[PDB]
Design a protein around this ligand. Structure first.
Ligand code: NCA
Length: 246
């Protein structure tokens, strides 16, 4: 059980949490870049992990994560757990099996979460206070589905996206260090939207060239063409989705 506490959290305690998560998720290396396990050769008993997100010794939740794609597929508060509508069928066989499991009304995608939250990622603040607020809300068991979706958007980005992208983990680090919430910039959003694109480019590459060019967006809304392993933005990839072996 990997843990992160918001009580007196620091840039360092958050970084160590993300590092521990990255170490558990890594299935291997491709072109020196960590990659998640190949789902087709992964044993189901090794597929799902739990992360504990706590505000104090008395207030904590857990999130269940699919190691094949780093997706949050479920969360738990006490004796009750809740699974995303499109959770893999096997997720509930391994996660929170000693709870009453419930199906959430929305899919775990940004598309549906943003629809249910009535807010885009760009509009939802991130940082220690947003995470603290979300932990309390899930532990309280409130049935507001709009806030459930917003809370997952926060957790997903501060946990899963941070694990995937050094840019995002560092941005959240800065937020905790400075105690200043932030909204995801166009660079952060573009990375989230192109994780599988970048992973595929790296792994299908030939002579350091991506079969297909990936188009990212930088901080100032300008397109940045990415078609090779040497491209500076490629360094921000901490964990890749498995697409194919070389
Ligand atoms: N459900 C998730 O963890 C998720 C959703 C969208 C993008 N990345 C992760």
């Amino acid at each position: 059980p990997i843990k992160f506490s918001t009580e007196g959290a620091t840039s360092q305690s958050y970084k160590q949490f993300i590092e521990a998560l990255r170490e558990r998720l890594r299935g291997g290396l491709i072109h020196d870049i960590p990659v998640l396990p190949d789902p087709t050769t992964l044993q189901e008993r090794n597929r799902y992990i739990t992360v504990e997100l706590s505000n104090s010794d008395t207030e904590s939740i857990e999130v269940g994560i699919d190691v094949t794609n780093a997706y949050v597929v479920a969360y738990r508060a006490g004796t009750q757990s809740h699974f995303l509508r499109d959770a893999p069928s096997s997720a509930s066989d391994y996660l929170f099996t000693g709870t009453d499991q419930h199906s959430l009304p929305f899919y775990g995608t940004y598309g549906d979460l943003e629809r249910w939250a009535h807010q885009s990622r760009q509009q939802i603040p991130l940082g220690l206070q947003a995470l603290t607020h979300g932990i309390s809300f899930f532990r309280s068991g409130g049935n507001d589905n709009e806030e459930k979706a917003r809370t997952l958007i926060v957790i997903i980005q501060m946990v899963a996206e941070a694990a995937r992208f050094r840019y995002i983990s560092n941005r959240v680090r800065v937020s905790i260090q400075t105690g200043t919430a932030f909204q995801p910039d166009a660079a952060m959003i573009s990375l989230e939207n192109n994780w599988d694109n970048l992973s595929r480019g790296v792994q299908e590459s030939v002579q350091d060239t991506f079969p297909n060019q990936v188009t990212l967006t930088n901080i100032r809304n300008e397109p940045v063409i990415v078609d090779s392993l040497s491209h500076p933005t490629v360094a921000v990839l901490a964990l890749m989705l498995f697409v194919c072996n070389p």
